[model samples]
Every structure is written in structure tokens, then in C-alpha cells.
Target: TLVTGSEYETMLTEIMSMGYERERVVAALRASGNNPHRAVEYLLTGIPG
Candidate 1:
């Protein structure tokens, strides 16, 4: 999921360090507008609106 796009990798990797599954991290970040914090919250609690 952390493939290509230097910028994308940075954020993607950042979230991955928190122990999230690779695929889930990708989706969470994508839907959370590239927000690491929001993505984490989204993953923890059920999908956010």
C-alpha cells in the first residue's frame, strides 16, 4: 500500500508505524483525507462519517 509517490509514502509509512494493517491503513488514510490522526480514529472506532 505504501508504493510509489514519495509524498504518499511518508504519510502511509507514518501510520503504518502505529501497527495498523497495511491495507486498512491505506483505506483509512484515503477516506480520512490523508489525515493520520483521523485515520487512526477511523480505524479504532468504526468507519467515520
Candidate 2:
């Protein structure tokens, strides 16, 4: 499964707004299955990319 481009952009922008570096946020987002909650948590703690 994959996040559509629009949703990917939305999530990316949303997470980035939290002040995380874009690259890591993107990685976290993907690693978290494109969910913002998981993305933040993954980044906060740790998630294998």
C-alpha cells in the first residue's frame, strides 16, 4: 500500500510543521505507514527506516 501523492504531501507538510527536518520526517512518515501519529512517535522515539 502507498499514500497517494496528495496525502503524502499533506502528511509531509503537517509533520514538517512540527519543526522536524523534512528528510527525517519523510522517512518517519513512510516508516510509519504515512500516519502522522505514528510518524511523530517514530521520530520522537525511534523507527527503523
Candidate 3:
């Protein structure tokens, strides 16, 4: 269900490279319209449970 191949890969890679978990990265991408910055921000400080 990948709409954007390269963009998705880039975002996922960037986020993963930063040491963020994979599942969190995927969730973040889904929540941020595949936005790397927003996703990273979310990873840095967004939700807590």
C-alpha cells in the first residue's frame, strides 16, 4: 500500500537511522502524512504511554 516509494523509503530510513523504533516510525509516518520532520518530532516528543 505504498503510495510513494522513494519518499517513504527516505523518511523511514531517516527516522530509523536516528535510532527510533521501526513500529513507532511507521506509526509516525502514518500520522504525519509521510512527513519525516513531523514524524521525528513525534518520535522525539509526542505521545507517551
Candidate 4:
């Protein structure tokens, strides 16, 4: 299972507010080890051309 702390909520909220799905945001967070900057960058790069 994925593990997250209280600080993770803020990053989740910020990513979600940008129109990303919950699952996608969570996956991004998990992939980045909860690093919001890296997660956001990952998400942005994922967008279709």
C-alpha cells in the first residue's frame, strides 16, 4: 500500500486543482516519493502532444 503524511494533502490538493485525476495525482506522488515538484513535472510531461 502507498504511505503518505499530512503534508502530502497539500500537494495532492494542489495537483488535483490543476485538473488531474485523483488516481493520476496519487500515482505521480507515489512515483516521485511525494515530491510535489517532481510529481508535477511528471504529470506535465505526461500530457499528450
The stretch of ten residues in a row with the least summed lDDT in candidate 1 is 1-10
- Give the alpha-carbon lDDT of every model: 0.79, 0.84, 0.77, 0.80
Q: Indicate which candidate wins on lDDT.
A: 2
Please give the lDDT score at residue 5 for candidate 3.
Answer: 88
TM-score of each: 0.69, 0.75, 0.71, 0.75
> How does candidate 2 fare on TM-score?
0.75
Scored against the true structure, residue 10 in model 1 reaches a CA lDDT of 85
Clashes of each: 0, 0, 0, 0
Residue 18 displacement in candidate 2 (angstroms): 1.0
Off by over 4 Å in 1: 1-4
Q: What would the per-residue lDDT of candidate 4 be over residues 1-49, giving only the tens digit for each residue? A: 4545766887788789989999999988878887777889889986323
lDDT of 2 by residue, 12-46 (tens): 88878879888999889778777778889998989
Candidate 3 vs candidate 4, lDDT winner: 4
User: Worst 10-residue stretch by lDDT in candidate 4?
Assistant: 1-10
**Order of candidate numbers by lDDT, starting with the best:** 2, 4, 1, 3
In the range 1-49, model 3's lDDT, one tens digit per residue, is 4557887877687779878788989998887777667777777889435
How does model 4 score by TM-score? 0.75
